[PDB]
Design a protein around this ligand. Sequence first.
Ligand SMILES: *[C@@H]1O[C@H](CO)[C@@H](O[C@@H]2O[C@H](CO)[C@@H](O[C@@H]3O[C@H](CO[C@H]4O[C@H](CO)[C@@H](O)[C@H](O)[C@@H]4O)[C@@H](O)[C@H](O[C@H]4O[C@H](CO)[C@@H](O)[C@H](O)[C@@H]4O[C@H]4O[C@H](CO)[C@@H](O)[C@H](O)[C@@H]4O[C@H]4O[C@H](CO)[C@@H](O)[C@H](O)[C@@H]4O)[C@@H]3O)[C@H](O)[C@H]2NC(C)=O)[C@H](O)[C@H]1NC(C)=O
Ligand SMILES: *[C@@H]1O[C@H](CO)[C@@H](O[C@@H]2O[C@H](CO)[C@@H](O[C@@H]3O[C@H](CO[C@H]4O[C@H](CO)[C@@H](O)[C@H](O)[C@@H]4O)[C@@H](O)[C@H](O[C@H]4O[C@H](CO)[C@@H](O)[C@H](O)[C@@H]4O[C@H]4O[C@H](CO)[C@@H](O)[C@H](O)[C@@H]4O[C@H]4O[C@H](CO)[C@@H](O)[C@H](O)[C@@H]4O)[C@@H]3O)[C@H](O)[C@H]2NC(C)=O)[C@H](O)[C@H]1NC(C)=O
Ligand SMILES: *[C@@H]1O[C@H](CO)[C@@H](O[C@@H]2O[C@H](CO)[C@@H](O[C@@H]3O[C@H](CO[C@H]4O[C@H](CO)[C@@H](O)[C@H](O)[C@@H]4O)[C@@H](O)[C@H](O[C@H]4O[C@H](CO)[C@@H](O)[C@H](O)[C@@H]4O[C@H]4O[C@H](CO)[C@@H](O)[C@H](O)[C@@H]4O[C@H]4O[C@H](CO)[C@@H](O)[C@H](O)[C@@H]4O)[C@@H]3O)[C@H](O)[C@H]2NC(C)=O)[C@H](O)[C@H]1NC(C)=O
Ligand SMILES: *[C@@H]1O[C@H](CO)[C@@H](O[C@@H]2O[C@H](CO)[C@@H](O[C@@H]3O[C@H](CO[C@H]4O[C@H](CO)[C@@H](O)[C@H](O)[C@@H]4O)[C@@H](O)[C@H](O[C@H]4O[C@H](CO)[C@@H](O)[C@H](O)[C@@H]4O[C@H]4O[C@H](CO)[C@@H](O)[C@H](O)[C@@H]4O[C@H]4O[C@H](CO)[C@@H](O)[C@H](O)[C@@H]4O)[C@@H]3O)[C@H](O)[C@H]2NC(C)=O)[C@H](O)[C@H]1NC(C)=O
Ligand SMILES: *[C@@H]1O[C@H](CO)[C@@H](O[C@@H]2O[C@H](CO)[C@@H](O)[C@H](O)[C@H]2NC(C)=O)[C@H](O)[C@H]1NC(C)=O
Ligand SMILES: *[C@@H]1O[C@H](CO)[C@@H](O[C@@H]2O[C@H](CO)[C@@H](O)[C@H](O)[C@H]2NC(C)=O)[C@H](O)[C@H]1NC(C)=O
Ligand code: 9AM
Ligand code: 9AM
Ligand code: 9AM
Ligand code: 9AM
Ligand code: NAG
Ligand code: CA
Ligand code: CA
Ligand code: CA
Ligand code: CA
Ligand code: CA
Lengths: 388, 388, 388, 388
Amino acid sequence: RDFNNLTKGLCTINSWHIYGKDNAVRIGEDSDVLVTREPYVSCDPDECRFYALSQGTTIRGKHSNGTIHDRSQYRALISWPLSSPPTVYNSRVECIGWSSTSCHDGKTRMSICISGPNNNASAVIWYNRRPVTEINTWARNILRTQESECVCHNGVCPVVFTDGSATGPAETRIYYFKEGKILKWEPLAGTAKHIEECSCYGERAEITCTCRDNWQGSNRPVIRIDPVAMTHTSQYICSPVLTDNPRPNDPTVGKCNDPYPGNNNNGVKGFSYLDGVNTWLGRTISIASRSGYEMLKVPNALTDDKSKPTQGQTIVLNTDWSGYSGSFMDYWAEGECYRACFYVELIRGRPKEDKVWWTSNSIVSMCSSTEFLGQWDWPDGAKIEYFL
Amino acid sequence: RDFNNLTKGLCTINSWHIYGKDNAVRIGEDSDVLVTREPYVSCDPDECRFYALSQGTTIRGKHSNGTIHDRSQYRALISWPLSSPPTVYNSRVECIGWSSTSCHDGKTRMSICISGPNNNASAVIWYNRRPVTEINTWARNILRTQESECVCHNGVCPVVFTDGSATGPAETRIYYFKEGKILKWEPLAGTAKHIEECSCYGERAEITCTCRDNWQGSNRPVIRIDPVAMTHTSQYICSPVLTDNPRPNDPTVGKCNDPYPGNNNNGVKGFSYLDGVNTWLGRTISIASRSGYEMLKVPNALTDDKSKPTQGQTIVLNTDWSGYSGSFMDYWAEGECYRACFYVELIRGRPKEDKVWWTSNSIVSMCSSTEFLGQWDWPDGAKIEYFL
Amino acid sequence: RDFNNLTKGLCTINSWHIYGKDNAVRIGEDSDVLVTREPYVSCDPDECRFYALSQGTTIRGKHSNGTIHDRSQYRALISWPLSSPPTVYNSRVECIGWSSTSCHDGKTRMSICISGPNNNASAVIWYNRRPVTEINTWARNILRTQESECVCHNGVCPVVFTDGSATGPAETRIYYFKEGKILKWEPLAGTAKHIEECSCYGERAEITCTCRDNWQGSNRPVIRIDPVAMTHTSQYICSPVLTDNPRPNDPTVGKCNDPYPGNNNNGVKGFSYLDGVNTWLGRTISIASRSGYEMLKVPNALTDDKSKPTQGQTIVLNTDWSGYSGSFMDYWAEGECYRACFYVELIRGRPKEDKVWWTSNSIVSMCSSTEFLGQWDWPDGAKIEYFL
Amino acid sequence: RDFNNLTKGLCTINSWHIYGKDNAVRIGEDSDVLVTREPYVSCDPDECRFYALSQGTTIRGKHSNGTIHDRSQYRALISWPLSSPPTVYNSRVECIGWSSTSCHDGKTRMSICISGPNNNASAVIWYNRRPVTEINTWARNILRTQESECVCHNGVCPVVFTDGSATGPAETRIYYFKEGKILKWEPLAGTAKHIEECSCYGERAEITCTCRDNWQGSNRPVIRIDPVAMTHTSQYICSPVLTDNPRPNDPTVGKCNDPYPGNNNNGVKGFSYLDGVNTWLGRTISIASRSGYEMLKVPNALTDDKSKPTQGQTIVLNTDWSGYSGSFMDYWAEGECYRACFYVELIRGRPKEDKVWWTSNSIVSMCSSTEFLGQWDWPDGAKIEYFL
Ligand SMILES: *[C@@H]1O[C@H](CO)[C@@H](O[C@@H]2O[C@H](CO)[C@@H](O[C@@H]3O[C@H](CO[C@H]4O[C@H](CO)[C@@H](O)[C@H](O)[C@@H]4O)[C@@H](O)[C@H](O[C@H]4O[C@H](CO)[C@@H](O)[C@H](O)[C@@H]4O[C@H]4O[C@H](CO)[C@@H](O)[C@H](O)[C@@H]4O[C@H]4O[C@H](CO)[C@@H](O)[C@H](O)[C@@H]4O)[C@@H]3O)[C@H](O)[C@H]2NC(C)=O)[C@H](O)[C@H]1NC(C)=O
Ligand SMILES: *[C@@H]1O[C@H](CO)[C@@H](O[C@@H]2O[C@H](CO)[C@@H](O[C@@H]3O[C@H](CO[C@H]4O[C@H](CO)[C@@H](O)[C@H](O)[C@@H]4O)[C@@H](O)[C@H](O[C@H]4O[C@H](CO)[C@@H](O)[C@H](O)[C@@H]4O[C@H]4O[C@H](CO)[C@@H](O)[C@H](O)[C@@H]4O[C@H]4O[C@H](CO)[C@@H](O)[C@H](O)[C@@H]4O)[C@@H]3O)[C@H](O)[C@H]2NC(C)=O)[C@H](O)[C@H]1NC(C)=O
Ligand SMILES: *[C@@H]1O[C@H](CO)[C@@H](O[C@@H]2O[C@H](CO)[C@@H](O[C@@H]3O[C@H](CO[C@H]4O[C@H](CO)[C@@H](O)[C@H](O)[C@@H]4O)[C@@H](O)[C@H](O[C@H]4O[C@H](CO)[C@@H](O)[C@H](O)[C@@H]4O[C@H]4O[C@H](CO)[C@@H](O)[C@H](O)[C@@H]4O[C@H]4O[C@H](CO)[C@@H](O)[C@H](O)[C@@H]4O)[C@@H]3O)[C@H](O)[C@H]2NC(C)=O)[C@H](O)[C@H]1NC(C)=O
Ligand SMILES: *[C@@H]1O[C@H](CO)[C@@H](O[C@@H]2O[C@H](CO)[C@@H](O[C@@H]3O[C@H](CO[C@H]4O[C@H](CO)[C@@H](O)[C@H](O)[C@@H]4O)[C@@H](O)[C@H](O[C@H]4O[C@H](CO)[C@@H](O)[C@H](O)[C@@H]4O[C@H]4O[C@H](CO)[C@@H](O)[C@H](O)[C@@H]4O[C@H]4O[C@H](CO)[C@@H](O)[C@H](O)[C@@H]4O)[C@@H]3O)[C@H](O)[C@H]2NC(C)=O)[C@H](O)[C@H]1NC(C)=O
Ligand SMILES: *[C@@H]1O[C@H](CO)[C@@H](O[C@@H]2O[C@H](CO)[C@@H](O)[C@H](O)[C@H]2NC(C)=O)[C@H](O)[C@H]1NC(C)=O
Ligand SMILES: *[C@@H]1O[C@H](CO)[C@@H](O[C@@H]2O[C@H](CO)[C@@H](O)[C@H](O)[C@H]2NC(C)=O)[C@H](O)[C@H]1NC(C)=O
Ligand SMILES: CC(=O)N[C@H]1[C@H]([C@H](O)[C@H](O)CN)OC(C(=O)O)=C[C@@H]1O
Ligand SMILES: CC(=O)N[C@H]1[C@H]([C@H](O)[C@H](O)CN)OC(C(=O)O)=C[C@@H]1O
Ligand SMILES: CC(=O)N[C@H]1[C@H]([C@H](O)[C@H](O)CN)OC(C(=O)O)=C[C@@H]1O
Ligand SMILES: CC(=O)N[C@H]1[C@H]([C@H](O)[C@H](O)CN)OC(C(=O)O)=C[C@@H]1O
Ligand SMILES: *[C@@H]1O[C@H](CO)[C@@H](O)[C@H](O)[C@H]1NC(C)=O
Ligand SMILES: [Ca+2]
Ligand SMILES: [Ca+2]
Ligand SMILES: [Ca+2]
Ligand SMILES: [Ca+2]
Ligand SMILES: [Ca+2]
């Protein structure tokens, strides 16, 4: 109807309740479930759906062999009903490509897919399910974007892209789209030194993105965007509670304007909700691999370089595989505040489970509760041996 | 449009006509049908659908091994088109969890799913397909609810929950929700001594629930709710025609305010329509197991401790497996009265049929007729041997 | 919107064009297609769909063994998109039972399914997808109905039922329903001596049904109904071009008011369009079995006992299996006349092809053209050997 | 709402961006994907879908054996969601037949399917999903049409048909339909000597069709239609850049009004966008077989007999199989110009890959960009060996 405006603040997060879970790998053992990875969740004014990058083959299909690879001509951004698995028969293709983002502006949806060879990729921006704008690679080195939803404010939907090295300085740009057209773009500014896969959310006319510094940081870079002025700033989460992976053990003091050292050229897409005392960080339990997942309440994590946890909640046990994680919220829910939500990608198969030739995942998603709810762990649930 | 009000009385039940049957286990022998249990039926103003707790795997899938277990992280409340089987491709997830209830208030639907470990479960109340309220376990011992539809009156939808022992006194609460928010809750009152899995229906601004006294009763406890005053009473069906299972043989006089003895710590979800002479009780034919199913007209069963049958109808032969049963009605049908309906869960597999490693069910459902219709029996129809 | 009225006459039939074909058995060899039989086609104001009695199992499923049987608790009337096959995932259950009819009155649809044991069957009449009326068996000997669409005029939808012997006089009734309620019913009148499976159509406020005299007639009985006066007449098609099956060879003079002799206690559901010179009869090519299918223009067939063909069109070769056939028309099409249509059930499996343990069918459907179109034959197309 | 009018001109084509890709053969290796061929794409005012001629069997199905054949009673025009594969469960049958065309006029869709034996075929024209007009074969030698979308202007939708020899002069007709009824038809005029499978598009009240001269031409015949005057002209693309297949090597001067010689009695459906300097031609890279695919910017190709490429883009490598290609545009997109689009049919199986007994394809589709985008190649992606 009218463009949505980020007029509410976040609800108080006292715990996390189960929101969605598709048990895709369990079900796909004996049904036509597509192989995927890089999932996320995004809402329309009347529905919330699961999203992911399909690999263009079912898990039991022979073409599942080799799906550990990230970029192929057989990938596409698909969406499907909440908590259902991504099947051949219920998956709606939003666009073709191996890197994506998508968000609804209140009137209709914008989806972006990047495709092409490493030195000649291009982004196609779709709006109202039609292609509207295209952007060619500017650094000719894997043009790539969020892998989770973007956020809109009065028609303006900022999106973070990176083109260039994954192990040195790269060329990150913040594009401001409206109805799929480019209003403006700016090069990354601030103190974040490397940006990849931003996880964003909005509240009170401000959009916050927690990203991945693949080059040197084990703390996460943060980009805060003003969608009206179409400007931004960047820094790192100050807190010593490190949230990338792999990462060194937690120190007692973090870094606010530089990558916290110890691990180079690697990382995992992640997220956080930075809202004063109502601050919660997500991270893998393991400092070595994408194992387990927990939420930690770390008051003022963004600005306090000595901030430590005051509460927490385990989402996935350290004895279970996790993966990417990102933020989304139902901006069209009732009430006076936006309920923070996130999803965790539960990766199965290669490289951790190499008895199978494929790599896929299932999804688990939670939203915040003002109650202090009891906790459960939520594993993918499949038995690899069944696939042998 | 407007909240539905229970303005009609029940139609006269002179017999039962076939309403729906999904033949899920038969069909699922060679199609992607989800393993389920704890099914029910519930209507929206423009459609009636089947509901159940999925086990997050197909019947032929290898992950079907172990589905005799009731609570796992892979369960979810799903709904699907009337008389179709619950397939991977047509099942809509309403929420995640291992205990549920759901009902439409005339404007939109409220669904409730409980999840978590035994000592830390929580209920999430969804309204208009969005999470609205959460309730943490109060007795830290398997927070659980109806496993069949709730009933609404002018926006108020009462729901019965139990937390605590299944073999001694527990903490049952009646919650009064409106638009997914809690208006009030009260602890169970009256003479019912233990409450589990209430089966409810409404007529003339009163909601009647027939439940399961797992601890000591072979007669069924009854909770009658006033959704306007938001108050209730409880007692037992007085009739000597005992309807739980397992149960002792029928005596000549029942008990009105105490559990009828003979069988402890066990039972099955069941239901009844208590409307003076127009009273009909459902029960398994077997007093020992979930075998067979019959409807018995027992005038004034609720208040007459010597009431015996005056008419009956066999639904499932004693040589066929039955299971849970519950009430629902299409509150949005035409006419001057509400047509009583019920479903019977036809459980197949473990523990009765242990040649297979799974446990699932199909559904059969009937509604009342003012005619005196001929009767047929309605078995699940599948051949276990085909699954070997 | 408003009830449809049969205000148009039939279009001139100069030939038949292909309308729909689902290739169900071919496709079902490797997909989840339900076993069916007794199919038909019926239109809603905005869509035309295929209908049939499912057997509650897929063709490749092990439960397909035994589907030669006509009445079981696993059957149901299902409908699905035009020319798609009846799959587990796209079939919508209209009601439960082993004999049916269905028709749209312009506002909504009425569907009728009969179920139960041979001596205690009952019909449930659904309207607007809700059960409204029930009728108990009156002769306690396989209450049965059309197996093809009924026809409505200003809300009144007549339906022909038969209860009683299939090899002697039976009790046939014409019920006049409106909004699923019984307005009136009358016992069969006229000279038709036995009635089963009527195939009907309407034009100019008159409904014509061509049925099956199972007891003695090889010519087909005809019931003409006035839906306003709610009265009818019956006779036989006078023409010597005999259209039931099995049947004796064609004579030079038929019978107008009595069954044409030669074959007893057997037959096949069939149809015709009786409109003066614009008269076309359908029939199997074989006089011995349900083999082949042809349309013959037989001017004044209904009233001329010496009428012979003046034109024809082969639909299915005598070297291919056919089966039931019936009439339907899209009463909501544009133009000044109703275009006559029909379907032919292409039965595969038992008893003619007993190397497989199942019995199913596919559907082929045609409508009339005012052009004189070239002809093709339309076989089921499946290879039984593939199923071995 | 109102009939669409071709009021815009083509957007400037500076490159081609990926639009859709269904990876049908890859996915169908382990899911119920229908065997097809002769695909295309066509838009409705609110959705764009993939179209193709099904073979009435899945790829893994045993009935896939023999699908190299073009005309059978088991074929049908089906459509399905953009970039999804054509599955048994998501494919909507538009009509029955082995040659087709389809287009939306702004209000509703017209679909045409031709069926029958070679000497007695007939076309049935459907409008608003109902059969409206039928046309009998006029030359009794494989009545055939476009195999890609038609184009409408103010309700008038011209369609090119050919009946007669494929290796000598034939009888081509241009039919002008409106609401599925024939307004007028004319015999082919101009200098094109043989016409088959026209690929059309519209801009500024003119419809341009690039077809296939199967008899003698390696250059492509072009028919330009005035849908208001309902008249046309025909010629050949003058350019020496030859675009049919097989074909001789490119000369330095082409032919404007006669077939360019060198290859007889063969060809492939193809297309082009003829718009002055904004002219782009599609063609297989191989001059011998349906291998590879490229787009070439050939300014004034239609009228300049010496025109050579000034820019290009590879779509499919010469080491990958291609096939048919055709034009379509989303006439209902926003903006001031129509964005040129095309699809390429990626044929797999027989005759090029005869280790399998079937012939099918997948689809890849692109639209133009005003940017100069980097290029990628888009193969079908399946491994034939997996099917052995
Ligand atoms: C029923 O359900 C309820 C609701 O969930 C359950 O109650 C919950 O219980 C949780 C577990 O006990 C609890 O979560 C913990 O909260 C701690 C914060 O609370 C405590 O501190 C504050 C502040 O002084 C007090 O006010 C408060 O009262 C508590 O005492 C967190 O500190 C916990 O997280 C830390 O521990 C877990 C291991 O359990 C780690 O995985 C996590 O990463 C944290 O520890 C690491 O990081 C810190 C920060 O840098 C380091 O100091 C520390 O050494 C650890 O570092 C190592 O490990 C990390 C990760 O592997 C690695 O990166 C690093 O390098 C080091 O190797 C935890 O979050 C909930 O808050 C609580 N909720 C409520 C409402 O009560 C209840 O138990 C359930 N009931 C039953 C019967 O089960
Ligand atoms: C065509 O269709 C029609 C329509 O369905 C068919 O007609 C129906 O026929 C039914 C079966 O005959 C009939 O159902 C029975 O009705 C009895 C009530 O009617 C009779 O009593 C009244 C009152 O005096 C009379 O007015 C009336 O005229 C009749 O005489 C019920 O009593 C029957 O239920 C009892 O029997 C069945 C076994 O058949 C048990 O399964 C059931 O539980 C009841 O019996 C148990 O319970 C009582 C109550 O405590 C005990 O007293 C008794 O000993 C039994 O207890 C044992 O078993 C239970 C269960 O296992 C166990 O818990 C306990 O411990 C003990 O071990 C039955 O309901 C329909 O009413 C009738 N309908 C109509 C409209 O006529 C017709 O036959 C069909 N035609 C054909 C040709 O098939
Ligand atoms: C391109 O397509 C066009 C369009 O379809 C093709 O043209 C069509 O060709 C058809 C076949 O030739 C033709 O159909 C036949 O029409 C006959 C009627 O036309 C003739 O008679 C009239 C009247 O005098 C003339 O005006 C007219 O010009 C013709 O001469 C029918 O009589 C035909 O049906 C009879 O024959 C077929 C066998 O071919 C039987 O299957 C059928 O049942 C009819 O014969 C039986 O029944 C009669 C009636 O009782 C008996 O008299 C007779 O002995 C047969 O009885 C035996 O068989 C039956 C069935 O098994 C059994 O029950 C009984 O006991 C006996 O054993 C036939 O319908 C179309 O009308 C014609 N259409 C047009 C517009 O022209 C064209 O050929 C195609 N082109 C190519 C190149 O292929
Ligand atoms: C990142 O992406 C960008 C964007 O895609 C990439 O840049 C693109 O690069 C393309 C390949 O280099 C280029 O495409 C070529 O363009 C040529 C036209 O440009 C040139 O000429 C003009 C005019 O003088 C100049 O202005 C311009 O600057 C260039 O110099 C075309 O001529 C090319 O097509 C010809 O070559 C290809 C083989 O590469 C053939 O397949 C094709 O059919 C053409 O050649 C045949 O046909 C002609 C015409 O008759 C004959 O003269 C010739 O001998 C060939 O004939 C044989 O082969 C055919 C086919 O098999 C057969 O039928 C015949 O009988 C003969 O056997 C080609 O289209 C893009 O334009 C360019 N785009 C842009 C915006 O720059 C960039 O490289 C990528 N970056 C990286 C790092 O990869
Ligand atoms: C979001 O905020 C903008 C204010 O900028 C609102 O957009 C005014 O809205 C009315 C109705 O659409 C128009 O008459 C104005 O011209 C609108 N736009 C602007 C840019 O001034 C918008 O309505 C708000 N969204 C919601 C849901 O209230
Ligand atoms: C079919 O015929 C009946 C005439 O009997 C029409 O029903 C009059 O229609 C208007 C609008 O619905 C009302 O004000 C009258 O009272 C209607 N009914 C009767 C029974 O008199 C009906 O509209 C016709 N159907 C169509 C499509 O025109
Ligand atoms: C466009 C692309 O390839 N994205 C990939 C991303 C990228 O490699 C990383 O951001 C370092 N540059 O890494 C991962 C990953 O599981 O780690 C998966 C993504 O598919
Ligand atoms: C929440 C839960 O576990 N419910 C289970 C219920 C419960 O055990 C009983 O109410 C006794 N407490 O029993 C049964 C059962 O088939 O008997 C199945 C339910 O899944
Ligand atoms: C209700 C019922 O059984 N109908 C059956 C019908 C019936 O036997 C016949 O009308 C003679 N009475 O016959 C046939 C048949 O293929 O011949 C199939 C139907 O399923
Ligand atoms: C109606 C029909 O058969 N069309 C066929 C067409 C035709 O043979 C050609 O136009 C020469 N006449 O050829 C091809 C082909 O792959 O080459 C496929 C089409 O199915
Ligand atoms: C089918 O059922 C019959 C009868 O029970 C049995 O003899 C036969 O072996 C069965 N065949 C299969 C393939 O199940
Ligand atoms: Ca399968
Ligand atoms: Ca890092
Ligand atoms: Ca009990
Ligand atoms: Ca007969
Ligand atoms: Ca040629």
